[PDB]
Amino acid sequence: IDPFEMAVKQLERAAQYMDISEEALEWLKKPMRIVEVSVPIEMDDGSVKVFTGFRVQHNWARGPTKGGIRWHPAETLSTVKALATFMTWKVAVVDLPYGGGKGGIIVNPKELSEREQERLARAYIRAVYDVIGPWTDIPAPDVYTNPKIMGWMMDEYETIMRRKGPAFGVITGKPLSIGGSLGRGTATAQGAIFTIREAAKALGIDLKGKKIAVQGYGNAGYYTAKLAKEQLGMTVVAVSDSRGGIYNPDGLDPDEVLKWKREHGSVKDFPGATNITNEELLELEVDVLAPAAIEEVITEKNADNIKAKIVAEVANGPVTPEADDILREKGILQIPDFLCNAGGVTVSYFEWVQNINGYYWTEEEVREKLDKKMTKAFWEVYNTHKDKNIHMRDAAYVVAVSRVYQAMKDRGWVKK
Numbered sequence: 001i002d003p004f005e006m007a008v009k010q011l012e013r014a015a016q017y018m019d020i021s022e023e024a025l026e027w028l029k030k031p032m033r034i035v036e037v038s039v040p041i042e043m044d045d046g047s048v049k050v051f052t053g054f055r056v057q058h059n060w061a062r063g064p065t066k067g068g069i070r071w072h073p074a075e076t077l078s079t080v081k082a083l084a085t086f087m088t089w090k091v092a093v094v095d096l097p098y099g100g101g102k103g104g105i106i107v108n109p110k111e112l113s114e115r116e117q118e119r120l121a122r123a124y125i126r127a128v129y130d131v132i133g134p135w136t137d138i139p140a141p142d143v144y145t146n147p148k149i150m151g152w153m154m155d156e157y158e159t160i161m162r163r164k165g166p167a168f169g170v171i172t173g174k175p176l177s178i179g180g181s182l183g184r185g186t187a188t189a190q191g192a193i194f195t196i197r198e199a200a201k202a203l204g205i206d207l208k209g210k211k212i213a214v215q216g217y218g219n220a221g222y223y224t225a226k227l228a229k230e231q232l233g234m235t236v237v238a239v240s241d242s243r244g245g246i247y248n249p250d251g252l253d254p255d256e257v258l259k260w261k262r263e264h265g266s267v268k269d270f271p272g273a274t275n276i277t278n279e280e281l282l283e284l285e286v287d288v289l290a291p292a293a294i295e296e297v298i299t300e301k302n303a304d305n306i307k308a309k310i311v312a313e314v315a316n317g318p319v320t321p322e323a324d325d326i327l328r329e330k331g332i333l334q335i336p337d338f339l340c341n342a343g344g345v346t347v348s349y350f351e352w353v354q355n356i357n358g359y360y361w362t363e364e365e366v367r368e369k370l371d372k373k374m375t376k377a378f379w380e381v382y383n384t385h386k387d388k389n390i391h392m393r394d395a396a397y398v399v400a401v402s403r404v405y406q407a408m409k410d411r412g413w414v415k416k
């Protein structure tokens, strides 16, 4: 279905668990500002190629909009709008002074050289300059988009701004040399681990030796497994990748699994471990299930097969609403995706704060601030879920949309 219509339907489904005026719902149903520009670059051969770029600012009631830029050949305006709407609730759920934004360029970066990529990054900034800024709209890395491109775009923005204000704060995810932040690489996994700790505390169970079956071995998944093993007292018993997955009741070492995967191209066939399908790992007797590879790994046809006490949605939407309602019945505690993986945007906010203050924090301060933020956000969502007797995803929507509504009413944008 159309991603934007799906996001609007999700917001409308959330709207009936809270008292929100019709005018506010109609306001939140459409992005406040959408910018579509031509992005011309000189290719290596010498020809000029024009690309289509997007920058959607859904809502800036709570502050400047935040959201990454994805370089994908299948990128559409509808997807960018849906993701900007999602970023609004994402930043609202962790109580950030941010709004929701999103950008994108319809391009295949694989067919682009380094110089062509830098030209594209600089031309995108030269085109969307008038609607971005450290207090207006702060982009970030996304799919096929990395700190190198952030450094290039930051440099272009500083050249246009003539170093008048803090140009480091215009974009996040930059390298450490130019206004980068420590703790950025493990932000999503660290936040997910904090939320898993809070969820286990809510369930009133001890984590000394409990099984965890991480699904996926990306930047999310590998670090999620490593931190679950490291400072959580847990026991990694199953990890998986696109090619396959492994299982060991005795225990597992995430680092030895990662180096084997890097030296062979996949985790599959880890010595001393039984190779199992990703489906078999999804339905495995564990306490924490943490999908961090791809969305929609849990469906109605297999939702009943999950026995995990906690399902930590590190991936961006791995559970469907049908499976959501099915899994709520069994008593399985669910952590919504835009609450579980909010550590990335929280550390991006920390980077922006350090940039605007001109003062940079150590790893320990970043970790502690993120710990407090994630703990507060999870407890706010869970108390709403228990008080209203609703699904954790619905409670997170109620919290985020309520925050944005309150900001909109206080600005006077809407009356009722």
Ligand SMILES: NC(=O)C1=CN([C@@H]2O[C@H](COP(=O)(O)OP(=O)(O)OC[C@H]3O[C@@H](n4cnc5c(N)ncnc54)[C@H](OP(=O)(O)O)[C@@H]3O)[C@@H](O)[C@H]2O)C=CC1
Pocket: 188, 189, 215, 216, 217, 218, 219, 220, 221, 240, 241, 242, 243, 265, 266, 267, 278, 292, 293, 294, 295, 314, 315, 316, 341, 344
């Ligand atoms: N970690 C982060 O910084 C962030 C995490 N997320 C979400 O986390 C998810 C993963 O991101 P991240 O791990 O960082 O990066 P990647 O998506 O690059 O890594 C995910 C890995 O999971 C494996 N995988 C891919 N598809 C499947 C599949 N169908 N079944 C099983 N395993 C699969 C692959 O391992 P391989 O191909 O090598 O076998 C892949 O490299 C995404 O949905 C993302 O939106 C959210 C925000 C940021």
Ligand SMILES: O=C(O)CCC(=O)C(=O)O
Pocket: 066, 067, 068, 069, 087, 139, 140, 141, 142, 172, 344, 345, 348, 349
């Ligand atoms: O980190 C950010 O500010 C936004 C990146 C993004 O799109 C996300 O985390 O979903």
Ligand SMILES: [N+]
Pocket: 188, 341, 342, 343, 344, 345, 346
């Ligand atoms: N994030």
